[PDB]
């Protein structure tokens, strides 16, 4: 569960671009594209990104990096 | 006022009525009328023709 | 998909570019089958198909064809939504006024051609003529005729003339017009002529010209050629169940343009004569007239109706138009609505929400997840899987809700905090359960009000309520970081008996080792709750870095109090539970408790608060009843006391010694003295009559009386609602305003009979209607202070600036009123402020002060603190962040991009339902006196001859505990700086007597003073003194009217006596009424009399629209020596005399007033030349922004202290930034604008430091404050000027002008249906920004 | 002061008056304005306390 969003604001600052940064990894979790990185309790991919975001291990330049690794996977693996 | 019926009213009202003997004579002008545009067909031989 | 909205007038060409019809025929649809008539206003080849993808007659009904049109019937085979969006179009056949163009305000066609427009009403019904570019015979351009006049003009000249009459002669005169030689014209008029009122109507014409010629129009478009209609879909004519239809009244209009059409056409067939056409053409101008905009003619009304019908600009603008009922709110899907209730067993995150509310909202979510479990084969056999409401699906539901946050919504959505969010807990039932916490927020009670749900459908929106709008996130209000999840009632009073202390109780005075044996004894019954009691407790501090220090101790307390210390979280210390904790306590535990220890232990330790609050209320059976209410002894002995004082003011009025004024004044003082009588006997009586005893004979204490614990503990009601109940109530108030000398006598613990019950339903029902009436008046304040400051949006990090306002308190003549700690609390410095001994930084120059930097304020002697305010900003187009403040929901700094124009304006509109001698120093100190100029007289006192002079009472921590107004001419006991005792009157002015004291001493003579014209003589029957007196303006004669009465002084050589320290004498001139005391050749001293001259939310919504006062304050433009002019025109000429500058000022003063200054003084820009109200207006430009800001934030912040509530003057701050953002240019030089236009501040601002970054000269400027009502509608970007106010004048005036919306600031944005440029939307808005040209 | 301030002088001025103050825009009659102001104040049909 998650009652308070503190912890996601103290790692993530501005308090609008954790929106933004859990709404696209909960996209990543949600489109199978990804699976999560914290074990779940049955909560919905809203509150498994907020808490991968309160892990430090998301954030958006990690999800830049992550996003541009496959695309150097894409583009090894055109073949 | 802007009341446009009333406009027309008094844009009308200037003209006055007519006698019972100038609706003849305005008639009669009818007749002049007809009969010059007549007169003027008279004249012209490729409608007589048609 | 698009950018920027563009706005402009219609060609002809055009106009037939967006039509697919030509719409010939009257009719709408056939009577018999309701196929659409070819080619009427619902037609077939014009608009589009019925039916989706097929033809009319039938030959095209499938999907084979999409491109085809039907050689029978035209029918473009497409979608019908295609015939909610093709329009037509009116061939009309003689040309026709726009209305728009015509009959608004400022009208377009009026001062286009500079004619009035009565003049050209009159061209237009066919009542004269008007010469259209005629030569120049004998007949001017706009010479209008009239037909005699124009047999006179025709029969004079045969040839070379030309003036027609009607919308053809408007068309010709517009068309002829050419536009670039009268804008020659007019500069040439403006550059040589000055005719100072014409000439500035004149530069409105010009800067009309040159806005007209730069945009893309021509002026003929103003008069309409063909007219466009509107797609059918819009205007639609359906079937009702019953075979009878549905009609929009455009119907209607375009039937009865179309029908006047085609009979102008089928006369001008004819050949009719000239009164039958000019009949028709007028008509056919009403026809379109009342199309566009019916309203503004005779009102021509509707069939079988005597209601006026509904035209197009009925259909945009108002309450009901397309702006404010369908754009900018829109009723909405998955929402839902039921009777709200309490259910205490919640945490604050969480709200219950009924199961069949659940499965409703709910149900393609239940869709989805039973079409991926498998469950249901196809989504129509979900449909029936949950419409039979099987025992599958609530498992399901249960699912989907788990994490789901909804909102929840009261229908005053006054403050932000009308919407939150939550997680909801399945009830059975068919009530909200909402969490009692969270309802002083909402201003909910349940007493039968109902509340919406709306369920977040997308993820985003999921996360936005989560992180932004969840319950536990808003307990700070954004009007001050007061709490707003406030307990409210019952756990106010649950607390206030558990933590209280009673004299002799069980365990009186016993030993304890903790809180839990606390507990263990109050729940077995050997010891009571309360009872004084040495406990040991443990609480923890963070006395190191975010560290916690544990100290243990025997605290003397009481039972209840270490129970509730369990509750408590680590960081607190035991003084925050060692008190009574009433309403006021416990805000300021949760304050200390958010401050130190964050948001997590405050959100559950509010839960935990109201847990045990409801439960021991419930363990302290806190019940009111009939002996609750303890009647005085002493109450019938008062009022038969003042029942033989009101019998003695009786006799002494029916004994002829008293009049009925002074009569009526004595008999309400004399009741108000036995009503205050009343209720120190019933406080006294209630509050200490407990008497117990312990160990001894007695001992009193504050008492147990049931009603006395909900008065102490602030839950419900105070001491006034309590005197209404047990003393008298009151006087009450005739409607008159006048208050009746019998006052009510009786209580409601006694009965009242039926005259008194029958006075007292007047004040009931004046206070209903007045509920009613102010809560409309604070709403349209709302919505005014909304639509003034959507555009200003938090932008920048930083502007770096060293502007800022000076932070004082704010004490005036009693004690303080609001200090300075609370008010700097969360703002921050421009420049670094310094300890008393200088040269000692204690904060540097920009810190966010928070409460340990008020703390290091506050152990130090600091008074006054520069604080950057928004008002003073640097940025463009918003406020930066570093600028603002902090104060939010949260406590740290705003963030990068969250609207604060609409939190403000709500902050400041929201509490709009809750609104409605000498020197008698109190306290001690030493004295100070600013701007004092003074001088001792003979007697030992210290008269002043400045009336700018502040008294300032600074103790010997520097600040200021008093300050007093001197007024101009008071005699001072002791002087400055001098230690100063309570009650001792300094200053003993006179305050019937306006003083002519001077600084010289010598012989007091006449000047000018002729006797029986300027002066009287008359022998005293009091004193005796016969004197010569200057009386008034009727009785002074012809010879001294103009020549004035004045005053000199010499010595006894006979020389003038001049001032010491100048050269100029005391020459003074006096009025009528001023009483020449001594006379000829009299001695004075220094400063003596020469002579003698004797005898709510409206508030808020004149002083944010800033209107002009009624009688304003007049002040001196530059400072100067004043001096008088000419004499007896009604006024005065007031000349003011620079030293440097160069002097020739003067200004008309209506001289039948009494002024302020003498002719021998000096004043200062923006001081005051008379009293009264001033105009925002002057104080702006004269002394400066940040005095006008000052002005008004103080004047406002005094309405609303009075009612006691707390606004935060960040929010009034930036109000005071959206009046002001439009600024007149004084001179262009190298800018493009004008000598008077008015363009606003930021857009003048990015022009000059282009051009000062260049070596060129700037454009200097002149501030103008607006009002709330004019400066939202003066904007660049008019949707947020057309979506409130008057619609017709903004689209016109920004239709003539080809202007063009960029869509800027968050009206536009919730228009037009995207993202916003504030709230998460604003990194998209940053993305695109950064994308969109570059 | 009423007087010194009405411009007209007899019956039918005023008359003419009123029913010009009262159907405006139309030029007047002696008859139609008798009639007028027979149906205003003292006409048994379009006027009446109970
Ligand atoms: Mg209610
Ligand atoms: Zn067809
Ligand atoms: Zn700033």
């Known amino acids: 569960a998650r009652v308070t969003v503190q912890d996601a604001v103290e790692k993530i600052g501005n308090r609008f671009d954790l929106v933004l940064v859990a709404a696209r990894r909960a996209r990543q979790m949600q489109v199978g594209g990804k699976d999560p990185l914290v074990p779940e309790e049955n909560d919905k991919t809203t509150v498994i990104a907020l808490r991968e975001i309160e892990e430090g291990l998301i954030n958006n330049q990690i999800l830049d990096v992550r996003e541009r690794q496959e695309q150097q996977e894409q583009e090894a693996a055109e073949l | 006022t802007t009341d446009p019926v009333r406009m027309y009213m008094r844009e009308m009202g200037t003209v006055e009525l007519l006698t019972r003997e100038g609706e003849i004579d305005i008639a009669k002008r009818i007749e002049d009328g007809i009969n010059q545009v007549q007169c003027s067909v008279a004249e012209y031989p490729e409608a007589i023709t048609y | 998909e698009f950018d920027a909205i563009k706005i402009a007038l219609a060609s002809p060409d055009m106009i037939r570019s967006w039509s697919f019809g030509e719409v010939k025929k009257p009719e709408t649809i056939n009577y018999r089958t309701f196929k659409p008539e070819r080619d009427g206003l619902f037609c077939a080849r014009i608009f589009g198909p019925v039916k989706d993808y097929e033809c009319l007659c039938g030959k095209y009904k499938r999907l084979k064809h999409r491109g085809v049109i039907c050689e029978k019937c035209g029918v473009e085979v497409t979608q019908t939504k295609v015939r909610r969006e093709r329009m037509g179009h009116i061939e009309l056949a003689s040309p026709t006024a726009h209305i728009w163009f015509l009959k608004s305000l400022p009208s377009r066609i009026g001062l286009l051609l500079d004619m009035p427009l009565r003049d050209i009403e009159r061209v237009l019904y066919f009542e004269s003529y008007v010469v259209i570019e005629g030569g120049m015979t004998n007949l001017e351009r706009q010479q209008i005729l009239t037909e005699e006049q124009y047999l006179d003009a025709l029969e004079e000249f045969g040839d070379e003339f030309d003036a027609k009459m009607g919308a053809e002669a408007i068309q010709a005169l517009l068309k002829s017009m050419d536009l670039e030689q009268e804008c020659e014209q007019l500069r040439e008029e403006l550059n040589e002529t000055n005719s100072e009122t014409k000439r500035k109507k004149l530069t409105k014409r010009i800067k009309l010209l040159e806005a007209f010629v730069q945009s893309g129009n021509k002026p003929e478009w103003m008069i309409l050629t063909v007219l466009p209609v509107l797609p059918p879909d819009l205007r639609p004519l359906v079937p009702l169940d019953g075979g009878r239809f549905a009609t929009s009244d455009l119907n209607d209009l375009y039937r009865r343009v179309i029908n006047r059409n085609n009979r102008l056409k089928r006369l001008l067939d004819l050949a009719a004569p000239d009164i039958i056409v000019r009949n028709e053409k007028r008509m056919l101008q009403e026809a379109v007239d009342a199309l566009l905009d019916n309203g503004r003619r005779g009102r021509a009304i509707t069939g079988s109706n005597k209601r006026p019908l509904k035209s197009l600009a009925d259909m945009i603008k108002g309450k009901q138009g397309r702006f404010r009922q369908n754009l900018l709110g829109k009723r909405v899907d998955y929402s839902g609505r039921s009777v709200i209730t309490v259910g205490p067993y919640l945490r604050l995150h969480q709200c219950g929400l009924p199961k069949k509310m659940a499965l409703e909202l709910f149900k393609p979510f239940i869709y989805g997840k039973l079409e991926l479990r498998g469950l249901a084969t196809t989504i129509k056999a979900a449909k029936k899987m949950v419409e039979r409401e099987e025992a599958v699906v609530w498992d399901i539901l249960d699912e989907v809700i788990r994490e789901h946050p909804v909102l929840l919504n009261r229908a005053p959505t006054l403050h932000r905090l009308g919407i939150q969010a939550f997680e909801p807990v399945l009830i059975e039932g068919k009530a909200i359960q909402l969490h009692p916490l969270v309802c002083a927020a909402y201003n909910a009670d349940f007493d039968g009000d109902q509340m919406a749900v709306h369920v977040p459908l997308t993820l985003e929106a999921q996360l936005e309520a989560r992180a932004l709008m969840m319950s536990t996130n808003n307990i700070l209000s954004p009007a001050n970081g007061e709490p707003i999840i406030v307990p409210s009632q019952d756990v106010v009073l649950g607390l206030y008996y558990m933590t209280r202390d009673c004299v002799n109780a069980k365990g009186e005075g016993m030993v304890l080792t903790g809180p839990k044996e606390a507990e263990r004894l109050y729940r077995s019954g050997l010891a009571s709750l309360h009872a004084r009691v040495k406990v040991r407790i443990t609480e923890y501090e963070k006395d190191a870095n975010g560290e916690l220090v544990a100290k243990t101790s025997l605290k003397d307390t009481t039972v209840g109090r270490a129970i509730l210390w369990m509750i408590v979280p680590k960081g607190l210390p035991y003084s925050i539970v060692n008190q009574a904790l009433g309403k006021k306590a416990i805000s300021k535990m949760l304050n200390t408790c958010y401050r130190i220890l964050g948001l997590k232990p405050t959100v559950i330790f509010a839960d935990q608060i109201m847990y045990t609050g409801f439960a021991y209320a419930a363990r302290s059976g806190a019940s009111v009843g009939i002996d609750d209410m303890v009647i005085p002894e002493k109450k019938h002995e008062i009022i038969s006391e003042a029942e033989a004082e009101v019998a003695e003011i009786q006799e002494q009025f029916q004994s002829g010694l008293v009049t009925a004024g002074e009569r009526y004044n004595k008999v309400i003082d004399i009741w108000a003295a036995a009503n205050d009588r009343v209720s120190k006997a019933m406080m006294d009586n209630l509050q200490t009559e407990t008497v117990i005893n312990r160990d001894g004979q007695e001992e009193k204490q504050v008492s147990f009386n049931s009603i006395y614990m909900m008065a102490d503990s602030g839950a419900r009601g105070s001491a006034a609602q309590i005197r209404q109940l047990a003393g008298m109530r009151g006087l009450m108030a005739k409607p008159d305003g006048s208050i009746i000398e019998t006052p009510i006598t009786a209580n409601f613990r006694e009965g009242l009979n039926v005259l008194q019950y029958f006075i007292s339903t007047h004040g009931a029902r004046k206070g209903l209607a007045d509920t009613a009436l102010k809560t409309a008046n604070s709403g349209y304040l709302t919505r005014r202070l909304v639509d003034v400051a959507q555009d200003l949006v938090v932008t920048e990090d930083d502007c770096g600036t060293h502007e800022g306002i000076m932070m004082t308190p704010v004490i005036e003549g009693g004690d303080v009123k609001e200090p300075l700690r609370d008010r700097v609390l969360g703002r921050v410095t421009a420049e670094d402020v310094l300890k008393p001994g200088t040269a000692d930084i204690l904060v540097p120059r920009n810190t966010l002060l928070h409460e340990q930097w008020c703390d290091l304020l506050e152990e130090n002697s600091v008074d006054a603190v520069k604080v950057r305010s928004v008002v003073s900003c640097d940025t463009d187009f918003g406020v930066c962040a570093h600028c603002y403040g902090r104060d939010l929901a949260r406590g740290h700094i705003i963030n990068k991009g969250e609207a604060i124009g609409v939190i403000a304006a709500q902050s400041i509109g929201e509490p709009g339902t809750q609104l409605t001698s000498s020197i008698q120093v109190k306290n001690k100190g030493s004295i100070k006196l600013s701007n004092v100029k003074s001088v001792v007289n003979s007697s030992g006192k210290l008269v002043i001859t400045s009336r700018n002079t502040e008294l300032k009472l600074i103790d010997e921590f520097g600040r200021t505990k008093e300050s007093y107004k001197v007024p101009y001419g008071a005699v001072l006991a002791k002087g400055d700086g001098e230690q100063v005792a309570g009650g001792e009157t300094v200053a003993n002015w006179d305050p019937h007597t306006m003083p002519v004291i001077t600084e010289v001493s010598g012989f007091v003579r006449f000047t000018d003073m002729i006797d029986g014209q300027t002066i009287t003589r008359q022998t005293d029957e009091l004193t005796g003194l016969s004197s010569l007196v200057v009386l008034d303006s009727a009785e002074r004669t012809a010879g001294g009217k103009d020549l004035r009465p004045a005053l000199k002084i010499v010595d006894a050589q006979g020389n003038d006596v001049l001032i010491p320290g100048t050269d100029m004498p005391a020459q003074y001139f006096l009025p009528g009424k001023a009483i020449v005391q001594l006379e000829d050749g009299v001695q004075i001293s220094s400063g003596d009399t020469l002579a003698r001259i004797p005898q709510g939310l409206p508030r808020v919504a004149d002083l944010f629209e800033a209107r002009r006062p009624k009688e304003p304050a007049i002040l001196a433009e530059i400072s100067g020596i004043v001096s008088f002019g000419k004499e007896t025109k009604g006024k005065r000429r007031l000349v003011i005399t620079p030293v440097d500058g160069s002097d020739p000022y003067e200004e008309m003063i209506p001289k039948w007033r009494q002024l302020n200054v003498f002719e021998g003084e000096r004043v200062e820009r923006g001081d005051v030349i008379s009293d009264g109200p001033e105009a925002p207006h002057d104080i702006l430009r004269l002394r400066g922004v940040h005095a006008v800001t000052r002005y008004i934030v103080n004047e406002v912040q005094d309405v609303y202290r009075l009612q006691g509530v707390k606004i935060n003057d960040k929010h009034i701050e930036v109000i005071v930034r959206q009046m002001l953002r439009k600024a007149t240019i004084v001179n262009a030089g190298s800018s493009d604008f004008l000598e008077g236009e008015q363009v606003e501040y930021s857009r003048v601002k990015i022009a000059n430091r282009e051009l000062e970054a260049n070596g060129k000269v700037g454009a200097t400027y002149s501030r103008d404050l607006l009002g709330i009502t004019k400066a939202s509608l003066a904007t660049e970007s008019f949707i947020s000027a057309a979506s409130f106010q008057e619609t017709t004048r903004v689209l016109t005036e920004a239709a003539v002008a080809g202007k063009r919306d960029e869509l800027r600031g968050l009206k536009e944005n919730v228009i037009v249906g995207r993202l916003i440029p504030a709230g998460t939307g604003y990194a998209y808005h940053q993305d695109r920004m950064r994308r969109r040209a570059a | ?50």
């Open chain 4, 1 to 50: 002061e009423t007087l010194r301030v009405d411009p007209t002088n007899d019956r039918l001025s005023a008359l003419v008056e009123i029913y010009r103050m009262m159907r405006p825009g139309e030029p007047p009659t002696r008859e139609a304005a008798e009639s007028l102001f027979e149906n205003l104040f003292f006409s048994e049909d379009r006027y009446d306390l109970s």
